Amino acid sequence: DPLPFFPPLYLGGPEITTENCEREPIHIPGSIQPHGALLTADGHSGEVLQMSLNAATFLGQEPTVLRGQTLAALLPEQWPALQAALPPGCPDALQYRATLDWPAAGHLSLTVHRVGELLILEFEPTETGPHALRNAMFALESAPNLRALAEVATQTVRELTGFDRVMLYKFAPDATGEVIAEARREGLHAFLGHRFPASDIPAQARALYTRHLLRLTADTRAAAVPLDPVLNPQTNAPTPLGGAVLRATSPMHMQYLRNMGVGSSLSVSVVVGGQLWGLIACHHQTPYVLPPDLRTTLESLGRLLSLQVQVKEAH
Amino acid sequence: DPLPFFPPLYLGGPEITTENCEREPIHIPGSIQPHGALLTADGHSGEVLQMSLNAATFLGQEPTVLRGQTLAALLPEQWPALQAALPPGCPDALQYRATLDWPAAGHLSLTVHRVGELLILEFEPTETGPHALRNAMFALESAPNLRALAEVATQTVRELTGFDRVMLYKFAPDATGEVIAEARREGLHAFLGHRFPASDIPAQARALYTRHLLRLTADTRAAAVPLDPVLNPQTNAPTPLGGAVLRATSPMHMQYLRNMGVGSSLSVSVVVGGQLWGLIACHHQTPYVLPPDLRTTLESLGRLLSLQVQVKEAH
Ligand SMILES: *C/C=C1/C(=C/c2[nH]c(/C=C3[NH+]=C(/C=C4\NC(=O)C(C=C)=C4C)C(C)=C\3CCC(=O)O)c(CCC(=O)O)c2C)NC(=O)[C@H]1C
Ligand SMILES: *C/C=C1/C(=C/c2[nH]c(/C=C3[NH+]=C(/C=C4\NC(=O)C(C=C)=C4C)C(C)=C\3CCC(=O)O)c(CCC(=O)O)c2C)NC(=O)[C@H]1C
Fold it and tell me: Are B1-125+221-249 and B126-220+250-315 in the same CATH fold?
């Protein structure tokens, strides 16, 4: 049952410390991670309303010029499809995805979702079949018990991602946590069996993670890129970014990651009967962008795992 | 607890009638559906041991010339990967998949699996993201009860496939079945709520379907193409084809499909606690080849559904 948040810093909210961190408004940082670009658009007219400041790097056109243009003009091939895929009032975790062409090598990956009357569009460069998830299910299904399932799950996720460390972190009723399974690079010190206080993942983080099942920090040293304008014109209120993987990570968590010597981090919620049961928590020693298709796979695996857990705890 | 099978027809087995059909050796027809090609190879040397008679249509080289050649020479880029993916003694439902180039438009899709010391390779022409499965999970999860889940499942599968009819067929303890949910093209007569005798899916079919979760008939009027030679040289016994979607369908079932006015059929097992709970059973009015990537998606959905069923029946 999380505290209400304070205003974001850009609305004159207070600085975040270890005394008030459960009130950080992490879903509305007004900025993104610099390895992709983000636009927002009117969900009906398709008019481009906000743009990350770096958008020219990715889209090949100056942020000041793209604004106010409609998606029907900017994405003539994707706009109808995107409209149909994300109707008014659809779930905010529902996504449309397309891979577009661009002047730089490979493609751009486009991910879109809807919050209220706003569409949120994420672009990231890209260079995974249903088969990888399909093949994985077998060992997860054969695991004789919960601990075995967790061991299979982390090993499988490590094999699919290449991440230096993959943990299954399970929450206790006091919201403390414990590393119950771990697959890691040889010689990396074990976190297996270690317990952490509830404060390491504060209540508003756990609440968010029950709604939007995947979040990441691709470079624990990269500075965020502002959304311009920062508020949504539709509303003159902050833009909700919990549904965007590009969302800027809490600086408090960035520092936490750096203190651990973590270069890149990613986790997937394990949600059992609508409650946050735990996290598949992943680390890389250096910055790393997991491709969109792989993240999507990991999301589905998180759901598969949730159900298998729920099956075994009911045994 | 199925009867032992008779020899296949090509070993002088008897003709199959309505009196002896539970003894049809459906897993070893010695032939494939003509919309793809099949080779078998030695699991260690990679030597090509059997070939469907149509293989030149697909592979661009005469069946008599490809035989005895090794996969290390025929597929130099895929052979190492395929070896690594399918080690000796791996599950027979485990698959390797690659998309190859060929002189005819689009690509060839390659699917491989291992049975004992034999590798079975399937080639089919091809022109689906993890996103489709990912997006579907939401409505399946929100369904308040079992009947609602089944209704969501058939509608989702219909939307993903375009099939004229998608049913959820649930088995009773006497092995009779019932159509408990159905999504169908407007004006197609309903099978919803109809019951069928156990004999419609005989015991050796149900046994197979517990092991290999997807099978299909792409053209209920297409004649099968022999494997040449018909027996596996490794063993001078029939080649097990239950793990191959190209496997020729039982002629008894082909006639059953034609009597229903079905042009194309496909089903996915729903397996709950190791038992065959039921089938997502799909029909098209005309012949239709569901792409490999879509079949794989449907397989994963079958597993997702199995777990959700198992969750709700334990409620
Ligand atoms: C005063 C508040 C602080 C708090 C902030 C905070 N932490 C997160 C998110 C995460 N914290 C995690 C902690 C774990 N990672 C580990 O490796 C281990 C143990 C080995 C633990 C206990 C994790 C996994 C997350 C999820 C995100 C991720 O996987 O990287 C947030 C939310 C960040 C965001 O989503 O923007 C916040 C605000 N952490 C505290 O230590 C105090 C200082
Ligand atoms: C004397 C034996 C016969 C028997 C043979 C048989 N049937 C199958 C496989 C299937 N039969 C199915 C029947 C249903 N499809 C439906 O649409 C309905 C009701 C609307 C029913 C009851 C189904 C679904 C299958 C699975 C395959 C598929 O989805 O197409 C086999 C095995 C075929 C194979 O895998 O090679 C066999 C040997 N059917 C009988 O009627 C008697 C005549």
Answer: yes
Write down the CATH superfamily of domain B1-125+221-249.
PAS domain (3.30.450.20)
Q: Does the beta-carbon distance from A311 to B308 stay under 8 Å?
A: no
Q: Entry resolution in angstroms? A: 2.2
Domain ranges within chain B, ordered by starting residue: 1-125+221-249, 126-220+250-315
Q: What homologous superfamily does CATH list for B126-220+250-315?
A: GAF domain (3.30.450.40)
Lining residues, ligand 2, CB within 6 Å: B 18, 21, 24, 26, 177, 191, 196, 199-202, 205, 215, 217, 249-250, 252-253, 256, 265, 267, 279, 281
Crossing angle of helices B130-142/A292-313, nearest 10°? 30
Output the known binding site of B for a tetrapyrrole: 21
DSSP strand pairing (B225-228 vs B48-52): antiparallel
Instruction: Flag if A311 and B310 touch (Cβ within 8 Å).
Output: yes
State how far the Cα of B281 lies from the Cα of A233, in Å rounded to an integer. Answer: 49
> Distance between CA B107 and CA B99 in Å, rounded?
6
- Is B215 in a helix, a strand, or coil? strand
**Kind and range of the H or E run holding A228:** strand A225-228
Residues of A in contact with B91 (CB under 8 A): 138
Pairing mode of beta strands A195-196, A237-238 = unpaired
